[PDB]
Amino acid sequence: SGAYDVTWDSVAWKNSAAKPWLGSMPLGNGDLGLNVWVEENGDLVFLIGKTDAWSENGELLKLGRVRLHLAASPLVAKSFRQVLKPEEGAVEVYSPADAPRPLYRVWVDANHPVAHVEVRTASGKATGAQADLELWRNEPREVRRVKGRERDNVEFNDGFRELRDTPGSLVTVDPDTVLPAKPGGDRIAWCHHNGRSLYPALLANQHLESLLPKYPDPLLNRTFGAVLEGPGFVASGDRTLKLMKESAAFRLDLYALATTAPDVEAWADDAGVLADTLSGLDIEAARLAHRNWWRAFWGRSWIVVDGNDLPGGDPTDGEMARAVTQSYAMQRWMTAGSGRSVAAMPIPFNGAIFTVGKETPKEKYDPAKGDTGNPDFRTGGGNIPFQNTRHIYWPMLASGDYDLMRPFFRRYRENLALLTERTRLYDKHAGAAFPETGFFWGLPNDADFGIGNKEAVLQNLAIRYEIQGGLELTAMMLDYYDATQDTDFLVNTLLPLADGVAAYYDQHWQRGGDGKIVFSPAQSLTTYQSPSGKDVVNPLPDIAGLMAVLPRLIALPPGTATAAQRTAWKKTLADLPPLPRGKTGTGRNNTPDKVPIPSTTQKDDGAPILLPAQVYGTEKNVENPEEYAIFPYRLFGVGLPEIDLGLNTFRARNFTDSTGWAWDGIVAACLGLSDDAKREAIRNFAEDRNPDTGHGPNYPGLSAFSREARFKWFWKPGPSSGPGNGTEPALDNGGVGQSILQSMLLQQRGEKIVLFPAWPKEWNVSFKLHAARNTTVEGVLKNGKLERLTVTPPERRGDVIVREAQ
């Protein structure tokens, strides 16, 4: 216990004086989250996040900010300690640092939509106290892109990316409402009510007006907010609580609620009932159940790495091992904090609900410039891009974090009916296609679709034909089902989605003369595009996905998949073109011995490799799509045939970025390349100081730690996410990091479990990870030797293959 705690020994740090909100700690219960900090004056401040606080603009909003100010500063000169305790699910502040009980104890109940702030003066001497609601959305705020200055409004272009093509080039951020507080009461309350919605105009632009009566508006009249109260407080204003009598021990309770409401009073009635109900619960019983929830969560799985004690080693290896261990845990803490949405909202890759900021003063605000510092901002806006989001969820399987995965699958399942009707209308065949990115309700945004597009093919070439996510989602769900053996999940979530995706892939294209499907028009992820409709033929990601997924669907238990489904899937499988293969040639910048960047530059003497497609043009991004057959689809890798094909492909890759969504490290682990994998894990989760980087001086991809935040695991986006400083935490970075470390330890080969496929011997490790058939593997490697291995259930031990650390 304490193994993952984060301890700070001072209120002061690099940005405390001018930007204390950059020194927050995150904490959540899966739906409600806080970013909490202590300012140099001793105030406790926190921003409030919620997974489903979607505004009229589709913007994910903070619920607000709260400031607690004791009448007498509670800090002392002697010492100070602020600690994140993940196994108790809490943040605690001690002053002095050795005080027996914390000055501030902050937690979000694992089991209820309430957060608690408990205060205890160290002297036991009573104090007055005031809590202020700090809302910044008090009047409508204009964000405008002006004709001569398109690049100036980063808030417009990046924070409202999905709306960038709105006619008129104006986004208005509607304000919030503070409810009148009851005179003499101990409660204040506030919320945001969506009085309008972008959804009807979007359906009309996308030729889907006919679906408007069938699927209700997902934004209109959505109302979300919170109630703040505390025993012994009185509302001295609608935005202010104060202690009536000085106290040495007191508490604030924050209850959060989202619903659909005709007005804020209706919302407030339901939220007051929620507060009444939950305030009646015994807080110590709630605290015990909260702590037990977190103890069990951390007992599901772990990876604890350290340097071994063999003479001749390098102490930096131990330093890196420990840093990697802490980072892996902090990623898990943030995903759990945001990963049990009450409304099937996937974890936002661009900051989850743990973004921070501080609004610029109204008097300084310029609508033509916007405000990227404001608390609601996130680079990339609110749409959910699969290429980033998949990396958050893949590692949850080996962690055993099935509950964190269900909202992602549920999101797609709830969108399936609309997207099936859309496909029926657009394409006049069965099935459903899921765009690479779009709004949470499943449709692409109008910028990617095209304002006034007379057709139904997406205008944006980056994602015009990219629908591979549906296949990859199906593969992830198949792993979930194999692990949990949850038949209800199989029948009610996996199968309808798999049915739609597989039917689309069977019906949207035509068989050619050889009887095999010709995948054109098509593209290979976002890197090889098809402006002509003919530039890309037979992309490897999609073909590899069908090769990996269709046999598994065909083999599902009797009475789940239908015999008719099996017949259709078998025919699709039998009609697949081959996985794209070829030889090395000249790649990007005419470099030799590479994956040929124009498909036509293969050299007859080149090494045999996988290709990103059978036919493809020049690159428009920096993905290595040919590697999809290694990860996620496990067609090649250590312990599988044609390992040299996989290795040649990896060595010949054109793109070698690290951190963010870059997934080279995962592929290296899948190929048994322990050194490559270790290096990438160290870049994502630590700092790579090793001299020969294959990268320029001061390459940003040598470390993913935050540039400016005190909680350094608020990852920064990787260089391949583009030029700017993005939004932190970039959870795709930490998701990739988890996949790398897990894949170094454990990989599945159908029913078999391969341990230590790419593990460096200099690292001792104690781990517990999950696998298919409700199996856990708990192992301890010391000085390169497996000292202990416990497999549950025991009969599954016979399916474990133990490889040697390298």
Numbering used by the authors: 26 to 831
What is the paper's account of this structure, in its own sentences?
GAS474; an organism isolated from a forest in Harvard, USA. However, SDT91673.1GH139 showed no detectable activity on any of the substrates tested. A glycerol molecule from the cryoprotectant occupies the suspected −1 subsite in SDT91673.1GH139, stacking against Trp686 and positioned above N412 and Q411. The SDT91673.1GH139 pocket is substantially more open and exhibits less hydrophobicity compared to BT0984GH139. The openness of the SDT91673.1GH139 pocket is facilitated by residues T462, T551, A487, and D473, which replace Q461, E561, W403, and E472 in BT0984GH139. In contrast, these residues are absent in SDT91673.1GH139. Specifically, W162 and W490 are spatially replaced by R189 and R186, respectively, introducing a more positively charged character. In SDT91673.1GH139, one of the rare (<1%) GH139 sequences that lacks the proposed catalytic acid, E561 (BT0984GH139 numbering), this position is instead occupied by T551. GAS474 from which it was isolated, but instead may act as a glycan-binding protein for a substrate distinct from chain B of RG-II.
To date, family GH139 is the only family known to be able to degrade α1,2-linked MeFuc, making it essential for RG-II metabolism and a feature of RG-II-degrading bacteria. In this report, we present the 3D structure of BT0984GH139, alongside its homolog SDT91673.1GH139 from Verrucomicrobium sp. GAS474, an organism isolated from forest soil. Crystals of BT0984GH139 formed in space group P212121 and diffracted to a resolution of 2.7 Å, while crystals of SDT91673.1GH139 formed in space group P 6522 and diffracted to 2.05 Å, providing good quality electron density maps in both cases. Both proteins adopt a three-domain architecture, consisting of an N-terminal β-sheet domain leading into an α-helical domain composed of a core (α/α)6 toroid structure. GH139 enzymes operate via an inverting mechanism in which we propose that N412 functions as the catalytic base and E561 acts as the catalytic acid (BT0984GH139 numbering).
